[PDB]
Amino acid sequence: NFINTNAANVIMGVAKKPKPVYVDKRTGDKHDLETSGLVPKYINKKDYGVT
Amino acid sequence: MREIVHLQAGQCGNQIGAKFWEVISDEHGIDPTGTYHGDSDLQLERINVYYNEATGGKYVPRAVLVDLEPGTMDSVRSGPFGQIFRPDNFVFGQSGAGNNWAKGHYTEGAELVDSVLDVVRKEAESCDCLQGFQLTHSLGGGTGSGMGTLLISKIREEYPDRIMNTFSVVPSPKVSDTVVEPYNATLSVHQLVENTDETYCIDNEALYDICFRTLKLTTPTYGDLNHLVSATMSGVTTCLRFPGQLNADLRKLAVNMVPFPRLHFFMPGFAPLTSRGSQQYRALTVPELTQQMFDAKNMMAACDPRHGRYLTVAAVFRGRMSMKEVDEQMLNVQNKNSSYFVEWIPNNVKTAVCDIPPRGLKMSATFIGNSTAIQELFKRISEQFTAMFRRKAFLHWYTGEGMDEMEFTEAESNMNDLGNPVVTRGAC
Amino acid sequence: ATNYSANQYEKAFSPRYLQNWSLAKPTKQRISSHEGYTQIIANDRGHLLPSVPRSKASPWGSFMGTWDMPLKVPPARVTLTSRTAAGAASLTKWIQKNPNLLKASNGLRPEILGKPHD
Amino acid sequence: QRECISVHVGQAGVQIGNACWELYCLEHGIQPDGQMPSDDDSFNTFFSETGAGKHVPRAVFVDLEPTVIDEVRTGTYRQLFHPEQLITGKEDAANNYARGHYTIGKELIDLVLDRIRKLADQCTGLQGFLIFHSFGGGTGSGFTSLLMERLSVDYGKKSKLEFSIYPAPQVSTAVVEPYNSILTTHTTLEHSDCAFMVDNEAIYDICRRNLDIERPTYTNLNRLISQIVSSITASLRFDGALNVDLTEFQTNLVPYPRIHFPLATYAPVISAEKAYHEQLSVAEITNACFEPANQMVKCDPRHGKYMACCLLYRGDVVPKDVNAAIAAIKTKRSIQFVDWCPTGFKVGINYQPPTVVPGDLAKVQRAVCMLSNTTAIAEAWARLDHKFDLMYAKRAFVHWYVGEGMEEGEFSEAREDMAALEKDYEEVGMDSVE
Amino acid sequence: QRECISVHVGQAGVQIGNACWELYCLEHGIQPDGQMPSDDSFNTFFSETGAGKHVPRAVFVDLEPTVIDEVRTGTYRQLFHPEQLITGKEDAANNYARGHYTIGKELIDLVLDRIRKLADQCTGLQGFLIFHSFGGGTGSGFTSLLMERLSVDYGKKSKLEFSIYPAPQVSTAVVEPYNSILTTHTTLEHSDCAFMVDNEAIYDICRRNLDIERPTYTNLNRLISQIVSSITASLRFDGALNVDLTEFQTNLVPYPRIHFPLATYAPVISAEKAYHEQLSVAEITNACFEPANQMVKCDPRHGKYMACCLLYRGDVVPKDVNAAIAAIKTKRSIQFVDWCPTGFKVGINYQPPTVVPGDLAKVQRAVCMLSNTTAIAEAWARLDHKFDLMYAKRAFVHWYVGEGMEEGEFSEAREDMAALEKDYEEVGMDSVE
Ligand SMILES: Nc1nc2c(ncn2[C@@H]2O[C@H](COP(=O)(O)OP(=O)(O)OP(=O)(O)O)[C@@H](O)[C@H]2O)c(=O)[nH]1
Ligand SMILES: Nc1nc2c(ncn2[C@@H]2O[C@H](COP(=O)(O)OP(=O)(O)OP(=O)(O)O)[C@@H](O)[C@H]2O)c(=O)[nH]1
Ligand SMILES: Nc1nc2c(ncn2[C@@H]2O[C@H](COP(=O)(O)OP(=O)(O)O)[C@@H](O)[C@H]2O)c(=O)[nH]1
């Protein structure tokens, strides 16, 4: 029963946690957020403040 | 020497006081630049009641302009008599009241009350013997009601022995101009009752009636409507501005019209009013002035005095006129109409007769009436408020700005506890 | 920065008068006078002294950006007037179930006024 | 000291924007280059002098797809809008609220909120934020929600009106509109202030009957929506008799919390030929705004009760004739009115006669614009629900939404609160029998 | 009496110097052939020799020819004394070692001599403005060698180190991580103010604010030159609040270690966008804070300001500057550390920024902020993470070990760099009491 299969498929699904991308210019230029320095990413390391 | 500090709050207060300053500048001879260009020496004799002296013969109004939206003052400045006020008395704030009594009283207007009271303090201490304050506002809506009554309370706790006259534009019986006029009127009247010493209630529908039926105006504007309120304003402060016999200033008028402290709501009236087809049919005499005074056609509040009893009555005349005619007419009206006046006050009418009329007439007459018919206005606001308050309608913003249920309950109960002493005199 | 008060001249240096329309930092009104010297809390390098019970917040400010903010953001205004008990509970549990939005530099700062009909 | 930031979001927006800002310009003189051909400060409500005599529009056009905004960056008004106030993106949002409040929309939010801040840090007294969108589209329903919510986080209890194109009562230009519309109302029910609603089907008829345009396009319609934005903002640009600011429409209209969906209706929308035979008098203009064939939102106001109606008379309107008209309309027992609103007719009498764009509509020396909150908008919410359900029943076209970031459940919470909204219109309707 | 000597080091420095001196020669009229076309304001940067010739008080130094052997055949060959331009004969080949131990101990002698001569023809030296890339050999190796000896000699004399810092993503060197950690371990206790201007940042700023999609190292140097001409406008032109070089340190560097201030400029328009902009003191100031107009890819919002120094060149009425800093001190987006109540230096000059036939526009007012944000922790963390992705596998260590740098150093260096992390964190915490 394809109605019930499609309904179960859309009911029991988690979506993405989508990838964070930011646009800087008026034109629409996309840049990834993690690789750029405009995010706390390397603050939360394991060797911070310790040898 | 006596002085009056003129406060104008709100859009309505600003416009009415702008027309009033035009009226009194015409009466005193002050040109738009601010000099004197006149004919009689009787105009500078008592000019230190609304005008402060400046350098080189400049006369500047002693008026504080208050509004939380600096847009109506802009039109007032762009008008003819715009460059007459102090720029330092233009106390405005960048905001929008949005017709909230709560926002005009318990928020952003409270951020302007300090500057307003600074200017009021400066004007009050720049005097020899201050007698009181004249605030112009509209009960229906914000700024004039909320911020206006906040200044009323503040100025009353600063100066407790000065006459406070509130020219209040009350909500209309037929149509309305703000949705939350029952709320604003209820809270503002609750503030007005235990505060001001004199309240003149002007209703716009009554203004339309006296502009269409009496004046026979074809296109009445708010300038025209404001002008008659301004005429009553100029009429009431006449005895301390021009010489005459039986002078009656504001405190003498207050003494002779309030029998009890809560019964200070009045009904103004001006009556050299004649139509364009009928000023040449006019039969000028003091008895027609009394007749056109007392009839329920020139009342500037929408309260028929024939539906009640007159507690107290005042007439301030303006012109060289005999005393026998005035006295006999205002004994004759009481002797003829006996069910419209209270019996426990014998001769419940006052008379003042000054000598110098407005420029253009020969006799003028200002009517003040404390009557039972204001029960109709306060009761009408009462069922409008009750119908709006049972369902908690439009209470969203009044409680979002900080107020409570007990505020509105206390306001309605106080306005009913004033509706009771008004009606107890109709049944003695 | 402490954002002190200019006492008499504050209507100028109010946030909405200096053309700042975003919800701004408050101003410290009453200045508290202390007496005597104040002991050193750190060392030459700037590290705190060992005893010195420290704070618990992050060393950096909690600027919660457009990807760290919770979805279905609660409203800034909530006055619970002419509203049912269930809807009032839903809105209050919403603004209580978003805690990190309430404690942030770019936070919400909600206004929770009114009272629902029992 | 009366500026109004306008954030136009989506084709509809960018397009109503073109119309709105053309009228704005022809009204204050600002030519299609900024330079005002003077040889005074009223323009500040919408424009910002650079000092070199260039007046720059105070707006932030935002559209995840190019095209629309790009035709504005290369057209008559290409030198007015500061480049960084026309913020487009690269990819569209396929009529999917999801990719407007979650994926291809949460990327342009940072920059748009940025521009909005600079256009706010230059205002000496902001009145509000007029957001123009379409309830039925990616950016229109998606970016608006995110923008509205993030705005509330910053500008907290600051006014935020919402002129919108409400889903049609029969036509419709999409198959997924119903969904986007219900989702949008939910995220903005508590974050928006007074969202005005204009249906397109309605204007289409008002243009075939009252404006003699047999085949109306989106521009004929857009230009009439510009006349409405003028009257709503006229008081804070031109002198009048009863000024009405943009903070009073939230108080003298929105009655109870949720209910915040006023409806628009214009007056003297006549057409040259049929104006050589009409005294367009205050009364005629008013009675017309309450006729169930002019309401620019197909929703027969007769099948419901009025809750709050704020009229805005722009032109030569004797104050007395206004009081007279409102009285007559009140008597008429056809027009109804809830009991909890004795006084339900607000009035604003400005003086500047409606501006004539070299294009359509007659030169009227008088015109009104009503903004009532009829309980008759309930039919519309019911119709939107029939639609949302006829599809949600088979979880149709939901794969796309779960295919962005909208957890299936959200669809339920949305329609459930839309059902609450309908139950609200029932209560605010019933009249206490006591 | 207000002289300052520039010690441009490395190809990076020798090229930032070209633009800088073009702007310095323009500002004071000094022609490309060293001859002011028929007053004493050039003495801050140019000394006048008997034969009416204003020679530059600078020492361009590269451990290879080429870069400087192109300034000696360029349009500015009759300006620089044919001895200031000191050149080696073998590049340090991206090896701090071949620039602090090998090819370098053979040039330090001459360099310090030319510095002494230029530093003896100066009554009052405000300080030495050094320019180096935190990536290449000369830029790291020599700068250290120079700074260390510069200290021994000119002790108290300031030593401002304008420097190009490794970028978040882009980078034109695989041995960059190492070199950087090494130089910032030796120039951490022998330097003073170290202004960092990352390229990725400028590259972006250009595309965004000037619309130059594909820029070039020139477009960059020019903008870096306007930053230096702003730090040294009071030592030459007239102002309302003048700030000496000595001040930029005292009122910026909090604790000895935290000596790495960041940089940002205002009116960065392109003579076409500047037609729709007002460029008012408020617009220019709020932009010097906007995270998109910073010269080091790093959102300061995710950090805490420690001491911002805002310079104002042009028609800046004092009250404007006040309302601006005041609106900043109210916005929540910007937050400060607790130990810094007052946190803003203000320098109001009068000379409008000059236009060098290039990209920016003629503007009436313009600002330049040097904030000491703690948001630069990410930079040190990132940089060290990379030094550790390699100094773990002992990669490219044979090169440095074979020119001196006894392997041991790499370790001691990363240890001090771990202390940098600690400091930045602790020097930004709080106290419940
Ligand atoms: N006046 C006017 N209304 C429009 C215009 N375009 C669309 N609309 C209305 O708005 C609805 C959809 O418009 P939008 O939501 O703005 O479309 P969008 O968000 O830009 O989405 P896409 O362009 O399809 O990517 C349609 O059903 C129309 O009724 C327009 O250009 N002018
Ligand atoms: N303005 C400008 N900046 C430059 C130029 N060339 C390099 N840079 C900067 O300098 C950095 C690299 O400098 P270094 O690696 O130290 O150059 P080096 O030490 O001389 O090394 P070699 O050229 O191989 O001898 C680059 O990342 C750029 O940021 C230039 O020509 N002009
Ligand atoms: N007499 C007179 N009344 C006015 C005038 N302008 C406005 N009003 C009255 O003012 C009332 C509304 O003013 P209000 O809402 O208080 O303005 P606000 O104080 O700015 O909020 C209306 O009912 C009008 O009748 C005028 O020029 N003359």
Side-chain angles (χ1 to χ4, degrees), chain D residues 33 35 49-51 54 56 79-80 82-84 114 117-118 121 153-154, chain E residues 208-209 273 275-278 282-283 286-287 290-293 328 331-332:
Chain D
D33 218 57
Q35 354 262 152
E49 186 85 298
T50 44
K54 231 238 79 179
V56 172
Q79 272 283 329
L80 208 65
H82 174 25
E84 322 202 325
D114 200 343
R117 175 223 91 143
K118 341 266 242 38
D121 292 352
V153 171
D154 355 298
Chain E
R208 295 217 290 278
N209 325 123
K273 234 162 299 305
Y275 156 87
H276 321 264
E277 294 227 320
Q278 199 143 34
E283 315 200 336
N286 297 356
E290 204 194 320
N293 303 314
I328 284 326
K331 300 167 180 308
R332 287 176 309 151

Side-chain angles (χ1 to χ4, degrees), chain D residues 10-31:
Chain D
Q11 190 132 26
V14 189
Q15 295 233 12
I16 310 180
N18 298 325
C20 288
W21 281 99
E22 148 238 88
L23 187 86
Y24 286 173
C25 281
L26 54 98
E27 288 210 78
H28 300 237
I30 285 92
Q31 296 292 296

Side-chain angles (χ1 to χ4, degrees), chain B residues 9-17 19 66-69 72 97-100 137-146 169-172 176-178 181 184 202-205 207-208 221-229, chain D residues 240-243 245 248 252 347 351:
Chain B
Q11 183 179 183
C12 172
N14 274 331
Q15 298 271 287
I16 293 187
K19 184 63 75 174
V66 189
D67 178 352
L68 301 83
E69 175 58 68
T72 309
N99 290 319
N100 263 212
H137 59 100
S138 66
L139 298 181
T143 300
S145 84
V169 172
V170 293
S172 297
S176 169
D177 271 18
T178 300
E181 293 179 353
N184 300 305
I202 297 89
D203 214 347
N204 289 123
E205 307 305 17
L207 280 178
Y208 295 132
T221 61
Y222 283 132
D224 293 333
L225 301 176
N226 286 13
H227 198 298
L228 282 81
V229 194
Chain D
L242 265 185
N243 60 48
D245 295 275
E248 338 248 341
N252 304 320
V347 159
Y351 285 163

Side-chain angles (χ1 to χ4, degrees), chain D residues 9-13 15-16 63 65 92-95 134-141 165 172-173 177 200 218 221-222 225:
Chain D
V9 34
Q11 190 132 26
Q15 295 233 12
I16 310 180
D63 190 16
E65 204 247 314
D92 217 343
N95 274 340
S134 126
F135 277 24
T139 326
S141 71
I165 304 303
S172 135
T173 74
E177 263 163 31
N200 274 167
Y218 269 169
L221 271 59
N222 284 303
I225 319 194

Side-chain angles (χ1 to χ4, degrees), chain E residues 39-250:
Chain E
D39 200 72
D40 196 50
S41 47
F42 61 99
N43 249 355
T44 299
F45 264 122
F46 312 82
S47 97
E48 157 93 310
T49 71
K53 178 169 275 302
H54 322 284
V55 309
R57 300 164 126 92
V59 192
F60 286 54
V61 27
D62 215 327
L63 295 165
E64 25 125 350
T66 327
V67 205
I68 320 211
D69 294 33
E70 249 208 312
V71 205
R72 71 195 35 168
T73 98
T75 60
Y76 276 97
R77 63 185 101 76
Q78 354 234 5
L79 185 97
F80 297 94
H81 185 48
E83 298 257 81
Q84 299 166 358
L85 317 133
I86 300 165
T87 8
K89 44 175 8 129
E90 232 154 23
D91 131 73
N94 272 352
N95 204 328
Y96 172 98
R98 298 189 25 102
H100 191 222
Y101 305 105
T102 329
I103 339 259
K105 293 297 206 339
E106 353 280 328
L107 225 82
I108 176 83
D109 33 335
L110 178 57
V111 175
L112 284 194
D113 182 39
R114 289 304 298 150
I115 297 177
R116 196 224 9 114
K117 288 137 147 4
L118 295 178
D120 291 349
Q121 307 299 303
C122 294
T123 60
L125 201 58
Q126 301 262 29
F128 291 96
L129 308 171
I130 318 106
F131 300 82
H132 47 122
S133 150
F134 255 23
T138 321
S140 61
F142 205 72
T143 297
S144 78
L145 198 48
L146 207 43
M147 297 302 95
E148 302 143 8
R149 314 263 314 256
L150 234 52
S151 134
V152 184
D153 328 335
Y154 329 97
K156 50 234 69 173
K157 292 305 206 347
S158 112
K159 244 156 332 248
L160 257 55
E161 282 89 16
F162 298 71
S163 141
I164 295 266
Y165 185 73
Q169 316 174 235
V170 316
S171 171
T172 169
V174 326
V175 295
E176 232 178 70
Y178 277 15
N179 296 325
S180 3
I181 291 246
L182 307 164
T183 196
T184 341
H185 168 49
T186 156
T187 65
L188 193 28
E189 330 94 318
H190 284 316
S191 105
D192 268 311
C193 243
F195 297 132
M196 323 256 89
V197 47
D198 130 59
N199 315 89
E200 207 168 319
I202 320 154
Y203 278 142
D204 284 308
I205 274 179
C206 270
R207 165 169 62 73
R208 295 217 290 278
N209 325 123
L210 271 141
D211 239 321
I212 319 177
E213 283 273 310
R214 334 189 206 89
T216 171
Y217 276 153
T218 308
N219 295 124
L220 278 67
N221 55 50
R222 215 161 295 252
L223 263 56
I224 309 163
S225 98
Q226 291 258 32
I227 298 263
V228 199
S229 82
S230 157
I231 268 127
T232 55
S234 94
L235 323 174
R236 325 185 302 209
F237 316 109
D238 111 278
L241 293 135
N242 11 89
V243 40
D244 282 337
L245 283 182
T246 301
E247 303 225 309
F248 297 105
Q249 352 152 185
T250 298

